[PDB]
């Protein structure tokens, strides 16, 4: 129920941020698991968004 806007970081219960106008997301980090099947995948997204190769 508690959500936050990726932009101003506003906490809200609404699906769309009231002060910015954007789809808000759950105000809590993803569940963690020792498996992490997509670890290599998301690392490639970062390793590319940060410029590492």
């Amino acid at each position: 129920r508690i959500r936050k806007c990726p932009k101003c970081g506003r906490y809200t219960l609404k699906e769309t941020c009231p002060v910015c106008g954007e789809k808000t997301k759950v105000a809590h980090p993803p569940r963690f698991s020792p498996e992490d099947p997509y670890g290599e995948y998301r690392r490639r997204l970062k390793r590319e968004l940060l410029g590492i190769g």
């Binding site: 970081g9 219960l13 609404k14 809590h28 993803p30 020792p34 670890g39 190769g53």
Partner: protein, 311 residues
Amino acid sequence: ADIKREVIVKDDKAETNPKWGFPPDKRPIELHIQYGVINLDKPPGPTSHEVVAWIKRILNLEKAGHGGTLDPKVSGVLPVALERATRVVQALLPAGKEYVALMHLHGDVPEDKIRAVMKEFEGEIIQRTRKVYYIEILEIDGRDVLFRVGVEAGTYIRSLIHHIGLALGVGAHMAELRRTRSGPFKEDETLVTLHDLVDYYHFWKEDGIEEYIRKAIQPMEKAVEHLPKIWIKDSAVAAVAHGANLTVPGIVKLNAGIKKGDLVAIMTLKDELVALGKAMMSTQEMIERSKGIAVDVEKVFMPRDWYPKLW
């Protein structure tokens, strides 16, 4: 209550050896981790203990410890001290905390009434007696109240919500809770997730890039930012590092307002944390007197080798 305290210089000529120790933020990566604290965003589900266990596995550590237990269902700011800095979380016991909470009322209450009643809960409350610094209502949708609250250390939000429900006459339940601040740790660029740690550790160990893991871990000194400090001479650092209590002659400068019994952080002239301790005298006494024990050291962080005793 995190307003910069005044600093009073006792020894204007004190200087420090640039070869001994390191500026807190300029420590070789391994040392940085050995004396680091993570501003972790705890995910809901696992217990804090379990989260710390995960951190030890991810960073291949032997020791780690959290400051301010967050319940299983609660997410947010979870300071986790690592290895040699593990016990620095003790500096967070008296730290104030901020939370964002979703309260669900068990009966309909007018929006005007909710705002007035939650305005009266600011200040002293008994759950025994703790202080609520502020209650900021973010949103109100019928029976759901989303609010931000600043509280003194040890304040139970669930109980606070229960009492608010009693005051409203309809009763209330805490549907969700997220810690947004614990002492100097808050939701800023330093807040990292377990996945962030896994990936940054990979970039370091596999790709040889320490930049990200370095930024993901803060120097342990971050944990005592809200504590009164006492800066000491290099020679006094060696003595304290070897187990001695701090004596007045070793003090270079210190914060004003320190009083006997207060938890203080002993610092080197390079702002490195030497040890945590209980002040044995007040700031004034430490400045006036020229002898005696100024601090009863409870925990030493500084290794014996940074500021070596040389005979």
